[PDB]
Swiss-Prot record, chain A:
Main location: membrane
InterPro entries: ATPase_V1-cplx_f_g_su (IPR008218), ATPase_V1-cplx_fsu_euk (IPR005772), ATPase_V1_fsu_sf (IPR036906)
Family: Belongs to the V-ATPase F subunit family.
Location within or outside the cell: Cytoplasmic vesicle, Secretory vesicle, Synaptic vesicle membrane; Cytoplasmic vesicle, Clathrin-coated vesicle membrane
Protein name: V-type proton ATPase subunit F
Tissue distribution of the protein: Expressed in brain (at protein level).
An annotated GO cellular component: vacuolar proton-transporting V-type ATPase, V1 domain
A biological process term (GO) from this entry: synaptic vesicle lumen acidification
Keyword set includes Cytoplasm: no
Keywords of the record: Cytoplasmic vesicle, Hydrogen ion transport, Ion transport, Membrane, Synapse, Transport
Entry GO MF terms: proton-transporting ATPase activity, rotational mechanism
Taxonomic lineage from the root: Eukaryota, Metazoa, Chordata, Craniata, Vertebrata
Record carries keyword Transport: yes
Family matches, as Pfam families: ATP-synt_F (PF01990)
UniProtKB/Swiss-Prot annotation, chain D:
Lineage, uppermost ranks: Eukaryota, Metazoa, Chordata, Craniata, Vertebrata
Family assignment from sequence similarity: Belongs to the ATPase alpha/beta chains family.
Sequence positions that bind ATP: 144
Subcellular location: Apical cell membrane; Melanosome; Cytoplasm; Cytoplasmic vesicle, Secretory vesicle, Synaptic vesicle membrane
UniProtKB keywords: ATP-binding, Cell membrane, Cytoplasm, Cytoplasmic vesicle, Hydrogen ion transport, Ion transport, Membrane, Nucleotide-binding, Synapse, Transport
Organism: Rattus norvegicus (Rat)
Keyword Cell membrane assigned: yes
Parent sequence residues shown: 257 to 506 of 511
GO CC terms, sorted: apical plasma membrane; clathrin-coated vesicle membrane; cytoplasm; cytosol; extrinsic component of synaptic vesicle membrane; melanosome; microvillus; plasma membrane
Function: Non-catalytic subunit of the V1 complex of vacuolar(H+)-ATPase (V-ATPase), a multisubunit enzyme composed of a peripheral complex (V1) that hydrolyzes ATP and a membrane integral complex (V0) that translocates protons. V-ATPase is responsible for acidifying and maintaining the pH of intracellular compartments and in some cell types, is targeted to the plasma membrane, where it is responsible for acidifying the extracellular environment.
Protein name: V-type proton ATPase subunit B, brain isoform
Taxonomic superkingdom: Eukaryota
First-listed, main subcellular location of the protein, grouped into a coarse class: membrane
Tissue: Expressed in brain (at protein level).
């Protein structure tokens, strides 16, 4: 009934959040997270992002900034609030404030 | 009282009052404007300049409507008679600078300053509509400015003067630099009027440095040029040389700040209104204090010299910053 | 179209004046609602940015703690990725209210199903426990961020709707009613003028009859 | 009190001559017997109906909204029999009372009365239904010469400041009371709560009086100060510190 | 038929009708009112409390208008003779309570209820304005209530009765509690009027608990107190003890609900209308059903006992919730 | 020229003119109207289907008003004589199809088209009010369409024709499909009118997918079926076969668009007005260019073939889209 948490990110970041307590294998045996290994390309990454976005129990979604950039043309289509996407930093690449999907709505943030 | 030849004289030595209240005969109220303008014409014929101020042409028009109703004439637009517009036209037409009749070559004039009372600010009623279609200046006092303590309460947006063109011949001879100065001041005020809407949506800091210059110079002008403490000796009367010098200094500040920001927006050492305010606080204070020069204690020459000095110091500060 | 199509009359004038006052009252109420929503929206923008800044360091600390964990415990990432089972942390959709708008916010909630218990039994131990603890910190921070962002988007849409309604009231409804009131006043003046002319004609004819009586 | 009564079933011509008897007696008592007279003319709307009847009897074609064209001059002949005069201690003060038909302020009677007189005191239906007495809505009411009526040596030093502050706080209170239904009480700031408390206590203690409770202007000002002590000094922004320091305490 | 001394008697033993169909002559239509009022005065002079029902003063004013038009007089607004107000006043003012002439001391009265029928419900109709200038009571119509089929259709916000000051002495002696109940009912209804504008213009979400109580108890008063289907056996006539008891119970309910929410504000167990309604929905239903008590077959004492029982139940329910 | 017996003849041979321009004597406008209707009745008696165009009956009404004023008659509304309605009725009543007098059984007609020039462009004018009480067809024109150049400026919402029933006997055997085509066209335009207010106050974002198609096909009908530039070779005359074919193409587009949207609104691969607009730019432009067809340069056969070809293209593209 309640919402889950979903993650897309490096193996290290996913390990960290899993140790935090986010992971679960659903009745279909499909995890709520994905590690972005070099074998995983842009098309599959965005397929998983879209899956998280559609599925109603996902709730809060975490994505690193570089992966979000690689996913951007789906983050622009994402225009409903509840599936809350959070673009977060990583040891792989830093976070920056500019060009965040949600922050697009802010015009007074100089 | 007034000062003539260094002595204080009552203005009733040069003023005549056609004064009557609301219970005086209706024919008196309707004839009040004509009697006033005929006295003014008589004094104009002697080569004098006669300012005729009708306090309520709306109340004269109501007296006219009352007389029309008593005569049982057909009611025209919104109840006023069939001839309100023609009467207002033939009345305001009697103003003007004239080569007077008679042998001694003379020039006089009658200047009509006829006030009008729009219900709650509604300029649509026939008296106000005809008045604003027949007059050539509208000074547009404003109770909101009065409450904000902006004295005079001239709104400086609804106000207008169609005599600007006729006065080019005079300004280009005696105050040569005043016309572009006035144009720039009006532009600055309009620009702040525009920026006030943006600042509501996105706040003040969102503005470009040019728009910050506009906002702050416009604040300077409104607070220390248009606003005027008439009760105080120093600027109860502002000679036009003083006014043009004030506006010259302020618009020179505008030009210099605009130049400094525009020529350095592309550099690493980009200048900003904040830097300008911090560096030239002294010059801003002196510009704001320019009001305090008193023609009766400072001579015309001294006032001009002081304003030129302020210009030079502003130049030096901007030059050292740039 | 310009006018409301109510037929002129003094009753019509009263109705239209009441409707104009009603439209203006609604305009002011919705405008204050918009101002309240925009104030809250700007506050949430500021808080969103501050929480983003705080993430910019808490997540760095989390990554460095993970680095410490790997230095001692070895590479446990595969063990963690495999032993998933059921989520220890879950979220409940909680309600927040601004004006009349509803803002979704998230409760951070614990199930206690820590499958990664014992994963540091022989080596990882305190370093891996500290990693878990720091990522719990990060998860609290990020759930607060998601609450803020969900509220932010919902408020954005509600603010746009309210501004559109206010603009509609002050650019269509109010001008329409003002035009109708002006037309009503004009037509009532016409009624009075017609009646005046009829009565003037009647008085003229009565005078003529009186003269003819002599 | 010299009381003239023209009952609704007394002749309308007698209604016409009632205010002129009243004001002739007022002129006698004020400008000859040298005493300050207050003339209270009740139902100038009824007087205007009598004027309409007499005009129609003369067979004159109606004017605006049926009333005679010269109603401005007639109302002015009644009203303007007022004011102080040169060298005579007496004076005449007038309080015409108008029943605005349909509540239309643009109706000729109230409109010409607004042109001829020097203010207005509104009586409000909303307050009346709420059972506040006297239901004098202070926001649209105005007294153009209040600035001469009040002041040092006339009522008291703080009268103008207390009046302006009470009006400003009342306006803000009404604004906040409107906002309260939009945002709800739990979302208001503490300043809004202070303004709402002031609004309540203003309509309950200052406006609401009771028909037989006579308040000297000093007592009205003391009540005004009791109300303005709801706020701390810093939010009494329309009262000079010179007055706050002297009157605010206690 | 009506009960007197335990015997049913026709009202035509104490009634008289002056019939005037619309097609009868205009002069008779004009004299109908004067005949009726003269008969009422005659029966007043004997010591009886005559009531009189003028069935269309609007059509009486029509008769005056037509007669004036035929006489060729100048009309006032909307074509009515200028003396319409004088005629309506000379008619109405014949009402009142009197000490009759003649030596055997007695006091009759005449109570005039005058129907007005303005076009389109025009509150500015000249006959209506003239009537309002005279009448002490005005039971205005509300077309919104009429179209909702809420009867009576009295517009309790613009209807008025100036007799309340005079009736306070009677109430203080016979129905002591009624005056504050009346005051609070009017307050509640005005509060609902103010709140409904926001409820419809914005929404119900932001309302406070006292606002919910005001809205709901005001709906109770509007539906179950100010609504009276006059064709029903129990509510063709509502004795004043029944009226005051009903309103007393409803107003006491309002007071105790407000007391609950005020007591539990800023406290852990905050009470709300959402808890009051559910905790004591039976109380609300019985308050709604108070109207159904029938004086004809339920005694005065029985109805008073029922209403006292509702008061007891209300106090018990509130004390248990608290 | 019109072709008769394969020979071209100028229509002046069958047109007659009666001219009383605005500045020629006023009293003669009435004579002009009556002479025109009498000539029409003469040629109706011959067995011809005459048509009379009264270029403005408001001018004749103003002539009656001026003569009435010179006579000092009591006026009806806005100064017109009380008998204006009777004059207009007796003039319009001479219009019916008739079985002419005399022995050779003949049938003729006198159609009347009386333009009305309401002062101020409002149809509350007494002349237009009477004329609409008299006439059976009302082609109300809109200044706001004339300004945009949406000519003919007929306002399709208020205009009406009370002959649409008497004519179905003819339509359902000469132009069978046209009756349902017209019914659906009027339904489309009324639906778009209903949507206009919601869209103006809420914006297009809330519209359903079928509502978008209603709006867009209504725009297509307005721009490319209703408006007709009378001063061009292709649209100076628009035969009824061309009109019914055009409306059939547009209504058929409406039907297929709604079918496509409704049959896929429940699918995941929803068809939307945007997809239709992007896919069918050529088809929409062909529906917009249908008007340009020239009935004389392009024969009836070519025009009908082209409209059928466009229908085939639309069906092909819909099948290839869904």
């Amino acid at each position: 009934r309640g919402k889950l948490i979903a993650v897309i990110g490096d193996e290290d970041t996913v390990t960290g959040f899993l140790l935090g307590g986010i992971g679960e294998l659903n009745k279909n045996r499909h995890p709520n997270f994905l590690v972005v290994e070099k074998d995983t390309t842009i098309n599959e990454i965005e397929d998983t992002f879209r899956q998280f976005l559609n599925r109603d129990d996902i709730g809060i979604i975490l994505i690193n900034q570089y992966i979000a950039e690689m996913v951007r043309h789906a983050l622009d289509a994402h225009q409903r609030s509840i599936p809350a996407v959070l673009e977060i930093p990583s040891k792989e690449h830093p976070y920056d404030a500019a060009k965040d999907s949600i922050l697009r709505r802010a015009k007074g943030m100089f | 009282t007034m000062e003539v030849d260094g002595k204080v004289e009552s203005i009733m030595k040069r003023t005549a009052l056609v004064a009557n209240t609301s219970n005086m005969p209706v024919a008196a109220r309707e004839a009040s404007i004509y009697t006033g303008i005929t006295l003014s014409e008589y004094f104009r014929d002697m080569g004098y300049h006669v300012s005729m101020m009708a306090d309520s042409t709306s109340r004269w028009a109501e007296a006219l409507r009352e007389i029309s109703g008593r005569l049982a004439e057909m009611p025209a637009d919104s109840g006023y008679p069939a001839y309100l517009g023609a009467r207002l036209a033939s009345f305001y037409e009697r103003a003007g600078r004239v080569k007077c009749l008679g042998n001694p070559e003379r020039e006089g004039s009658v200047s009509i300053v006829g006030a009008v009372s729009p219900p709650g600010g509604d300029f649509s009623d026939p008296v106000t509509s005809a008045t604003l279609g027949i007059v050539q200046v509208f000074w547009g006092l404003d109770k909101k400015l009065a409450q904000r303590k902006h004295f005079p309460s001239v709104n400086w947006l609804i106000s207008y003067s169609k005599y600007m063109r006729a006065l080019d011949e005079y300004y280009d001879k005696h105050f040569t630099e005043f016309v572009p100065l006035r144009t720039k001041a009006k532009e600055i005020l309009q620009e702040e009027e525009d920026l006030a809407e943006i600042v509501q949506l996105v706040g003040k800091a969102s503005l470009a440095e040019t728009d910050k210059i506009t906002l702050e110079v416009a604040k300077l002008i409104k607070d220390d040029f248009l606003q005027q403490n008439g009760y105080t000796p120093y600027d109860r009367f502002c000679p036009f040389y003083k006014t043009v010098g004030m506006l010259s200094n302020m618009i020179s500040f505008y030009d210099m700040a605009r130049r400094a920001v525009e020529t350095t927006a592309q550099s690493d050492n980009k200048i900003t209104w904040s830097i300008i305010r911090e560096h030239m606080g002294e010059i801003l204070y002196k510009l704001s204090s320019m009001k305090f020069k008193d023609p009766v204690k400072d001579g015309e020459a001294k006032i001009k010299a002081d304003y030129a000095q302020l210009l030079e110091d502003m130049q030096n500060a901007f030059r050292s910053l740039e | 179209k310009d006018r409301i199509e109510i037929f002129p009359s003094r009753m019509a004038q009263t109705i239209m004046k009441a409707r104009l006052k009603g439209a203006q009252t609604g305009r002011n109420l919705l405008k204050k609602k918009s101002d309240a929503l925009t104030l809250r929206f700007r506050q949430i923008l500021k808080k969103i940015i501050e929480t983003k800044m705080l993430m910019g360091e808490v997540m760095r600390e989390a990554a460095f703690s993970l680095a410490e964990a790997k230095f001692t415990a070895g590479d446990f990432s595969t063990t963690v990725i495999q032993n998933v089972n059921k989520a220890q942390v879950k979220i409940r959709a909680k309600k927040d209210n601004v004006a009349g708008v509803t803002l979704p916010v998230f409760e951070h909630y614990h199930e206690g199903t820590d499958s990664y218990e014992l994963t540091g039994l022989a080596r990882g131990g305190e370093q891996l426990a500290k990693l878990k603890r720091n990522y719990a910190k990060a998860v609290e921070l990020l759930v607060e961020l998601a609450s803020l962002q969900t509220s932010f988007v919902t408020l954005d849409e509600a603010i746009k709707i309210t501004n559109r309604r206010v603009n509609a009231i002050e650019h269509v409804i109010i001008p329409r009613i003002e035009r109708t009131l002006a037309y009503i006043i004009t037509e009532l003046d016409e009624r009075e003028r017609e009646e005046f002319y009829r009565l003037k004609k009647i008085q003229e004819k009565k005078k003529i009859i009186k003269e003819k009586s002599e | 009190v010299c009381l003239f009564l023209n009952l609704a079933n007394d002749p309308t011509i007698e209604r016409i001559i009632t205010p002129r008897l009243a004001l002739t007696t007022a002129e006698f008592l004020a400008y000859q017997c040298e005493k300050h007279v207050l003339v209270i003319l009740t139902d100038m709307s009824s007087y205007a109906e009598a004027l309409r009847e007499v005009s129609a009897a003369r067979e004159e074609v109606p004017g605006r909204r049926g009333f005679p064209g010269y109603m401005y001059t007639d109302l002015a002949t009644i009203y303007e029999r007022a004011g102080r005069v040169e060298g005579r201690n007496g004076s005449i003060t007038q309080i015409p009372i108008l029943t605005m038909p349909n509540d239309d302020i643009t109706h000729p009677i109230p409109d010409l009365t607004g042109y001829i007189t020097e203010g207005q005191i509104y009586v409000d239906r909303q307050l009346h239904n709420r059972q506040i007495y006297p239901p004098i809505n202070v926001l649209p009411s105005l007294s153009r010469l209040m600035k001469s009526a009040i002041g040092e040596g006339m009522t008291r030093k703080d009268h103008a400041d207390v009046s302006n502050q009470l009006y400003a706080c009342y306006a803000i209170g009404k604004d906040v009371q409107a906002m309260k239904a939009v945002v709800g009480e739990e979302a208001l700031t503490s300043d809004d709560l202070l303004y709402l408390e002031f609004l309540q206590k203003f309509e309950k203690n200052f406006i609401t009086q009771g028909p037989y409770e006579n308040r000297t202007v000093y007592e009205t000002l003391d009540i005004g100060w009791q109300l303005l002590r709801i706020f701390p000094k810093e939010m009494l922004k329309r009262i000079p510190q010179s007055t706050l320091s002297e009157f605010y305490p206690r």
